[PDB]
Amino acid sequence: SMQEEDTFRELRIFLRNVTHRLAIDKRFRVFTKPVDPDEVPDYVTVIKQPMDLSSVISKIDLHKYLTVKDYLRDIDLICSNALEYNPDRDPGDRLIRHRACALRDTAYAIIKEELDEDFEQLCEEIQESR
Ligand SMILES: Cc1cc2c(cc1N)n(C)c(=O)n2C
Ligand SMILES: [Cl-]
Ligand SMILES: [Cl-]
Ligand SMILES: [Cl-]
Ligand SMILES: [Cl-]
């Protein structure tokens, strides 16, 4: 229905706003673009589902997220990919894991404060009726 399309459009607007606030945070610069296969050639072989914030924006626009849960799955993937690919005790690895966890925590905290639970519930029920 048109009421339902308005609901998903409002969701996309909200998700673009959250994603932009993540993307402009200096700590998360490393997560803003896909990992370049020329800087890191074995990445695409080790990490099976690469994800980054520019891809998240593309997916919003492709209407791939019908709920905030779908969205957080990809935020979580950004974080878990970083933990998996950089597991070592060295400070370069520890810095990116700390940033990855911060990205994840920050996104969840924005959503906890700013997403109305009834709005999410409506998105889920429309999505389940399809
Ligand atoms: C150069 C670079 C390396 C990365 C990276 C981003 C960049 N830009 N990420 C997200 C990652 O896990 N690694 C090892
Ligand atoms: Cl840096
Ligand atoms: Cl997909
Ligand atoms: Cl640790
Ligand atoms: Cl909202």
- Residue nearest to ligand 1 atom 2, measured at CA: 35
CA distances to 8, 34, 86 from 58, rounded to whole Å, are 15, 12, 25
Instruction: Please give the distance, rounded to the nearest whole angstrom, from the Cα atom of residue 48 to the centre of ligand 5.
Output: 31
Q: What is the CATH number of the domain that holds 95?
A: 1.20.920.10
Task: State the ligand closest to the CA atom of 78.
Answer: 1
Three-state secondary-structure class, residue 49? coil
Domain that holds residue 5: 1-130
Atom of ligand 1 nearest to the CA of 82: 12
Indicate the number of domains in the chain: 1
Helices 53-61, 2-23: axis angle to 10 degrees equals: 170
Q: How far is CA 7 from the centre of its chain?
A: 20
Q: Which residue in the block uniquely carries the two structure tokens 């610069």? A: 29
Length of the chain in terms of residues written = 130
Instruction: Please give the distance, rounded to the nearest whole angstrom, from the Cα atom of residue 103 to the centre of ligand 4.
Output: 16
Compute the distance between CA of residue 50 and CA of residue 72 in angstroms, rounded to an integer.
Answer: 15
Which DSSP helix (H) or strand (E) runs through 67? none
Compute the distance between CA of residue 33 and CA of residue 35 in angstroms, rounded to an integer.
Answer: 6
DSSP state of 125: H
Instruction: Please give the distance, rounded to the nearest whole angstrom, from the Cα atom of residue 109 to the centre of ligand 4.
Output: 22
Task: State the ligand closest to the CA atom of 74.
Answer: 3
Atom of ligand 1 nearest to the CA of 100: 10
Question: Cβ-count burial of 65 within 10 angstroms (0-12 exposed, 13-18 middle, 19+ buried)?
Answer: buried
